Design a protein around this ligand. Sequence first.
Ligand SMILES: CCCCCCCCCCCCCCCC(=O)O
Ligand SMILES: [Fe+3]
Ligand SMILES: [Fe+3]
Length: 223
Amino acid sequence: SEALPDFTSDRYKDAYSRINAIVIEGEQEAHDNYIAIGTLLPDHVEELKRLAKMEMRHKKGFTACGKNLGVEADMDFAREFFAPLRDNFQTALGQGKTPTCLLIQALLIEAFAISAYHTYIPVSDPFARKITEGVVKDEYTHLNYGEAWLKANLESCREELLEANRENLPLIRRMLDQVAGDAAVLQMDKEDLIEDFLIAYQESLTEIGFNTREITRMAAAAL
Ligand SMILES: CCCCCCCCCCCCCCCC(=O)O
Ligand SMILES: [Fe+3]
Ligand SMILES: [Fe+3]
């Protein structure tokens, strides 16, 4: 209780202006990514549209969280934060590389979100806590969607996935490093963020059909 941040302080609002922007930007990117995957999987378009609509609801919810605290979201900072990963997604999209697009959005980004949201909930203000608790359940759904498709297609895309992991897992690690200072002002421990991210991602890779040697090797790419 004494560990809860002072949500009204200038220090908190400053850090929140960047963290809030990143979440808003991320939800919008998630929407765009699922719609984009629909161009690669035309028979999945209705399901992907449903996922994308959920992302827009998350975006509006988190936008409201910033407004509730009297915070103005630093959207330029957020756009720059996502740019490297965004670039890799767009490159894969342009090459028709569906498994790479799904690993980036449905596995890496969803796991990062899940981890972040779980870590934020216990230290969040009462308004944002309700919103975030609602969102987390949806992200499980998104993770499961990506897991299911990759699991069904693993034998044809194994090597591409290893490559996508090698290229993109370090970007998530760099993002975690970049967000850590502001996250700490929000009373979130970077070690919790890293642990819960790796656990979520490891569990998804297990579901997809990777063995321990493979997953240890993949986790090691973050170095
Ligand atoms: C609401 C504040 C939570 C704490 C935020 C800590 C920084 C992590 C930001 C990652 C958000 C990624 C958004 C992806 C959303 C999705 O894929 O549905
Ligand atoms: Fe979302
Ligand atoms: Fe999502």
